[PDB]
Design a protein around this ligand. Structure first.
Ligand code: NA
Lengths: 323, 6
């Protein structure tokens, strides 16, 4: 099998996406490679939603390899949703050619989440148990057909440029320092594991007694249960403005605390610079509440600090300090 | 932001 490097483009530190090619001849799309879902879909000619109007739409009639499947697709995300119809076609991801791959063609993309997204579609990278009926995840096909060198992939999110990278089938040591640390997956659906505590200077501020978290490339922020998140916002000095936005005084950055996630026996600090979005002197919090869920989401805020490896052979997540 | 599946 082979290793494939898939360069990722960063849009506003909030979404990281790459190019795939679908059909014969290839129709090009940008997709968010999403470790928090398992379905692969792109917009199509059958969608008249606003989001479909300002993105690339797949035309199955122009593809000689397209085979319709007939089955419906419906996906709800934390932000946004889609309906569509499943089919089969060849998708190429870097140097890996994935024939007869199930792919959703959108018919509805309601609301503006996807209207204002830079990517066209989503390529999910989680477990088959999270996939819709009749939908086989792309990476599972790649493993089952022996197209990749190893049953793992790795994600680097560049803090200081556009060198972000998804590596299929390998880890790249140029993206981290120190040692890789392995964390067992608890529930095989999302890339989920146990966090033992969240502390500031040895004092527990959140996740008292342990909690579940997922590692999700497709979530921009660090999301947690609302009461725990509110405790963190208070500790770091993030204050809600009249519009509901949690603002941070930029001049406090060198005088603010580090928030530490204890994960399988190793500490994962987030410095003020790591958790604070800094926009030309205007600063906001990278922590976000979720309504009633209690499952944490370690999104791009976290992954920028920790090079992330997703190992399907052994059901592990790997973390290392990013370069 | 986005928060990607239910
Ligand atoms: Na294992």
């Amino acid at each position: 099998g082979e290793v494939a490097s898939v360069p990722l483009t960063n849009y506003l530190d909030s979404q990281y996406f790459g190019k795939i090619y679908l059909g014969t001849p290839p129709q090009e799309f940008t997709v968010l490679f999403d470790t928090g879902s398992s379905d692969f879909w792109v917009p199509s000619i059958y969608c008249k939603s606003n989001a479909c109007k300002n993105h690339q739409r797949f035309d199955p009639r122009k593809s000689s390899t397209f085979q319709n499947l007939g089955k419906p697709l419906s996906i709800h995300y934390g932000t946004g949703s889609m309906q569509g119809i499943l089919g089969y076609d060849t998708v190429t991801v870097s140097n890996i050619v994935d024939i007869q791959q199930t792919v959703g063609l959108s018919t509805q993309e309601p609301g503006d989440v996807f209207t204002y997204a830079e990517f066209d579609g989503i390529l999910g990278m989680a477990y088959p148990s999270l996939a819709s009926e009749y939908s086989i995840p792309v990476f599972d096909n790649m493993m089952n057909r022996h197209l990749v060198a190893q049953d793992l992939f790795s994600v680097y999110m560049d803090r200081n440029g556009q060198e972000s990278m998804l590596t299929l089938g390998a880890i790249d040591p140029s993206y981290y320092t120190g040692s890789l640390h392995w964390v067992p997956v608890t529930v095989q659906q999302y890339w989920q594991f146990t966090v033992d505590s969240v502390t500031i200077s040895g004092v527990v501020v959140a996740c008292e007694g342990g909690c579940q978290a997922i590692l999700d490339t497709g979530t921009s922020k660090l999301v947690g249960p609302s009461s725990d998140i509110l405790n963190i916002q208070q500790a770091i000095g993030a204050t809600q403005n009249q519009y509901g936005e949690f603002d941070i005084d930029c001049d406090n950055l060198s005088y603010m605390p580090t928030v530490v996630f204890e994960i399988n026996g190793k500490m994962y600090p987030l410095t003020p610079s790591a958790y604070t979005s800094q926009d030309q002197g205007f600063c906001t919090s990278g922590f976000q509440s979720e309504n009633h869920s209690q499952k944490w989401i370690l999104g791009d805020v976290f992954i920028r600090e920790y090079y992330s490896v997703f190992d399907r052979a052994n059901n592990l997540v790997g973390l290392a300090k990013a370069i | 932001x986005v928060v990607x599946a239910x």
